[PDB]
Design a protein around this ligand. Structure first.
Ligand SMILES: C[N@+]12CC[C@H](CC1)[C@H](OC(=O)C(O)(c1ccccc1)c1ccccc1)C2
Ligand SMILES: C[N@+]12CC[C@H](CC1)[C@H](OC(=O)C(O)(c1ccccc1)c1ccccc1)C2
Lengths: 234, 236
C-alpha cells in the first residue's frame, strides 16, 4: 500500500514546499521517489524530520526510505542502498573577500557553519573548526553572508540552486576548494530489505530508459553544472 | 586467501579480461585486477573459470562460480540477479569501415550484415533489427570481419574499440564510428540472487577502493580517462 519516506522539506532543490514553503512537498528527489512509488503501485507518505534525526527515524522504523543519501563504506556496511541516481561535489564556500582560507586544511580554528548530524559536520569536527550548527543550506549561506561564520562546506547542487534563486546575492561568494572526487547519492533503506531495494532498482532503470529521468533532472538542474550517473541498458 | 571467490570470465577480451604475453600468460585486465583487489580485501582468494561468453550465465546459474565481471545492468537481469554498485560505464558504438556510406544509424542496420558474439544482448538487438548476423568469437574477430569485408558493421562498446586502436593504431584509419547510443551504460559485477551479504561486501570494498586512490590506479593502468567514462566516487 504505502511507501513511507523520511525527508526534510526545507532543502531546495532536493526536498521543499511549493509557494515559498506553503504548498506540497516538491523537489528532484521528491518527484523521483513519487514516480518510483507510482510505478510500484504504492501511495507515498512523507514524514518530515530534521536532518539530524533522519537516519534515527529509519532505524526506529518510522519510515522505510531516505532520499539524497551519500554512499559511504560505513553506511554501506549497515544499510541497503539503491543504484546511485545522482552525484554531488563538496565545495568549500567562503565570502569573496576572504583571504585566510584556501583549502580544507585551513579550516582549523575557523568558524564553520554545518548541519548537525552530517558527515560534513563530523569532518569539520576532525578539522578542529569551530562549528556553528545551521538548520539548513539556506541558513549556512546566510550565516556566511552576515559574517557569523567564515566558511561552509556545501554540496554543489544546493549551492548552485542558491545562485539561481538569488543571483544578485551570489557574487558575494567564492569557492575556495572542492573534494577531488564527486560522490554517488542513492536511496537508503534498512539492511535486510532486499526486495524493496531490487524493486526501486528495477524502476529506476525503467525511468532512465523512457526519458522520465531526463525530464525530472532538467526540471531542477543545469546539466552543464550538475553531474549525473550512467544509464541502464536493454 | 584461505577460502575462495569463484569468478567466471572469458580471457580473450582486452582490456577487460585477457592473458599476458600475447595470450600466453596469466589472466589480466581491468575487471580482473579489480576483482582480485576486492577478493584480497575480503580475505579470499580468487579462482577464475574461463568460458565462452555464450556459457557464462549458465555457469553462474549452475553454481560453478559466484560472480561475473563486466556485466551491463538491464531491467531483465535486475529482475533475476544481484548486481554490485556500477564500477565502470561503457557506450555502445556502431562501427563501420571508414569508406561506408549507407549506414548512419542503428535503424540503418536492417538487412545489413553485422558481426556480433552469440549470446550477447547486442547479438539479440542485431536479431531484432533484422540484420544478417555473422557470429564472431570476440571483439577482435568482429573488427577483423569488418576489416576484411565479411560484414558491413559491428555494434561494440567503446572500451574494447578504443583498446583496439591503442594496440593497432595503424589500423585505426580503416574504421569510423557511425553512431552511438544516446546514454552510457552502467556495468557491474553480477552474482546470483539471494547472496545479499557478498553483494554488500563487494560494495563496501569498492567504495574503499574509490576512497584510497586504488581505483584511479587500476583505471589509469587500462584506460584513457579522456575517452572512457567512469562512475562517481564514494564519500566517508
Ligand atoms: C556528506 N553527507 C553526509 C551526511 C548527509 C549525506 C551526505 C549530508 O547531507 C544532507 O544534508 C542529507 O543528504 C540531506 C540533504 C537534503 C535533504 C535531505 C537530506 C542527509 C543527511 C544525513 C542523513 C541523510 C541525508 C552530508
Ligand atoms: C552490453 N553487454 C550486453 C550483453 C553482454 C553484457 C554487456 C555483452 O558483453 C559481454 O560480452 C560480457 O559482458 C563479457 C565481456 C567480456 C568478458 C566477460 C564478459 C558478458 C556477456 C554475457 C553475459 C555476461 C557478460 C554486452
Amino acid at each position: 500500500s504505502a511507501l513511507r519516506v523520511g525527508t526534510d522539506g526545507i532543502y531546495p532543490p532536493h526536498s521543499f514546499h511549493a509557494q515559498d514553503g506553503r504548498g506540497e512537498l516538491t523537489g528532484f528527489d521528491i518527484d523521483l521517489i513519487k514516480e518510483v512509488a507510482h510505478r510500484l503501485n504504492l501511495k507515498v507518505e512523507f514524514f518530515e524530520t530534521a536532518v539530524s534525526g533522519l537516519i534515527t527515524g529509519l532505524d526506529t522504523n518510522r519510515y522505510d526510505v531516505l532520499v539524497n543519501v551519500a554512499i559511504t563504506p560505513e553506511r554501506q556496511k549497515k544499510y541497503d542502498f539503491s543504484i546511485p541516481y545522482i552525484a554531488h561535489r563538496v565545495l568549500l564556500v567562503v565570502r569573496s573577500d576572504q583571504q585566510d582560507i584556501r583549502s580544507f586544511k585551513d579550516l582549523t580554528d575557523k568558524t564553520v557553519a554545518q548541519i548537525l548530524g552530517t558527515d560534513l559536520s563530523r569532518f569539520a569536527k576532525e578539522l578542529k573548526s569551530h562549528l556553528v550548527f545551521s538548520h539548513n543550506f539556506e541558513q549556512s549561506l546566510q550565516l556566511l553572508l552576515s559574517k557569523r561564520t567564515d566558511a561552509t562546506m556545501i554540496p554543489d547542487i544546493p549551492f548552485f540552486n542558491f545562485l539561481e534563486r538569488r543571483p544578485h546575492d551570489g557574487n558575494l561568494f567564492k569557492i575556495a576548494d572542492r573534494m577531488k572526487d564527486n560522490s554517488a547519492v542513492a536511496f537508503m533503506m534498512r539492511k535486510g530489505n532486499n526486495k524493496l531495494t531490487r524493486s526501486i532498482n528495477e524502476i529506476l532503470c525503467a525511468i532512465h530508459l523512457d526519458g522520465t529521468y531526463k525530464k525530472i533532472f532538467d526540471r531542477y538542474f543545469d546539466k552543464n553544472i550538475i553531474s549525473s550517473v550512467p544509464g541502464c541498458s536493454s
